[PDB]
Amino acid sequence: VKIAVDRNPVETNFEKWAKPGHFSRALAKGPNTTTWIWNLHADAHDFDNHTSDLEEISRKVFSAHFGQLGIILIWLSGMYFHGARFSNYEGWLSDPTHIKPSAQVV
């Protein structure tokens, strides 16, 4: 058991942002029907179908899971923030039974 990493596998650039459907062989051609659009958003995160390599599927998964945490943490920080600036927490804390909570002023 030991640490094993591969350095600089992928270059970072917006080249593939302009070319949607790069992950799949069928979609990289381009659209001639509107069905190409639905297939794009659907087969986006099916890493097992993109490539046979189990290594690349593992790299993609371990890094996408880092995204859901960041997505969660701004959501969680939003509740703390929205509870700080647009709420009645200090008032509810002194009379909890009669006062009701409110974190979404319109």
Ligand X SMILES: CC1=C(/C=C/C(C)=C\C=C/C(C)=C/C=C/C=C(C)/C=C/C=C(C)/C=C/C2=C(C)CCCC2(C)C)C(C)(C)CCC1
Positions in the binding site for ligand CLA (CB under 6 A): 20, 34, 37, 62, 65-66, 69
Sign (positive or negative) of CA dihedral 43, 48, 49, 54: positive
| Partner touching 104 among ligand X, other proteins, ligand CLA, none, CB below 5 to 8 Å by kind | none
Give the distance, in angstroms, between the CA of residue 5 and the centroid of all CA atoms in the same chain. Answer: 24
SS3 call for 5: coil
From candidates 25, 31, 58, 78, binder to other proteins by CB under 8 A:
31
Q: Cβ closer to other proteins: 36 or 47?
A: 36
Using CA atoms, how far apart are residues 106 and 98, in angstroms rounded to an integer?
Answer: 22
Looking at the chain, list the stretches that DSSP marks H as alpha helix, in order from N- to C-terminal side: 15-18, 35-42, 47-50, 54-85, 89-94
| Partner touching 18 among ligand X, ligand CLA, other proteins, none, CB below 5 to 8 Å by kind | other proteins
| Binding flag, residue 75, ligand X (CB under 6 A) | yes
Q: Cβ closer to other proteins: 1 or 52?
A: 52
| Interacting residue ranges for ligand X, rule: CB under 6 A | 71, 74-75
